[PDB]
């Protein structure tokens, strides 16, 4: 069960460019890019958790790490979309 992100980026490509296909080398580009971003953001969040005598990683540390990693317009759009997703998930009532 070798695990990869192929199906998910296949659909989010399919909701905006329906008549377009992906090559396998390109498929690997997006897979490696997603894994690299995940690794960078997660190790920065762990470093910031170890900053403050804190043994728990929560959403605030990842928000600070996103504001640290990304450039500014990407950062403000990422925290806007992530905050909307968190408020969608939390108000599941």
């Amino acid at each position: 069960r070798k695990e990869t992100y192929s199906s998910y980026i296949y659909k989010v490509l399919k909701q905006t460019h329906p008549d377009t296909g992906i090559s396998q080398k390109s498929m690997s580009i997006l897979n490696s890019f997603v894994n690299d971003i995940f690794e960078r953001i997660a190790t920065e969040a762990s470093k910031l958790a170890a900053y403050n005598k804190k043994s728990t990683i929560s959403a605030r540390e990842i928000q600070t790490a996103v504001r640290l990693i990304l450039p500014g317009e990407l950062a403000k759009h990422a925290v806007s979309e992530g905050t909307r997703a968190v408020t969608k998930y939390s108000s599941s009532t």
């Binding site: 910031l48 900053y51 403050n52 605030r60 540390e61 600070t64 504001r67 640290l68």
Partner: protein
């Protein structure tokens, strides 16, 4: 007079510590500019680091770990 806190003998000394002999008479402004961008990068990272810590003064520990993030790590002021 805001940016004019740093001056001609200061950057003359800094260029002399670069081992240069002849300077130009209007290398002033681009050095002032790169000065400004280096400080605003460093204290922007320091402000975010101290914002997450709920510490509304900027400490030395934050700026040395800001440099260690930036790849210009400092020794002697903690770490």
């Amino acid at each position: 007079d805001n940016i004019q806190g740093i001056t001609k003998p200061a950057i003359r000394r800094l260029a002399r510590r670069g081992g240069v002999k002849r300077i130009s008479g209007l290398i002033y402004e681009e050095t002032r500019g790169v000065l400004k961008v280096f400080l605003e990068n460093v204290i922007r990272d320091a402000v975010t680091y101290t914002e997450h810590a709920k510490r509304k003064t900027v400490t030395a520990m934050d700026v040395v770990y800001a440099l260690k993030r930036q790849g210009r790590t400092l020794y002697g002021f903690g770490g």
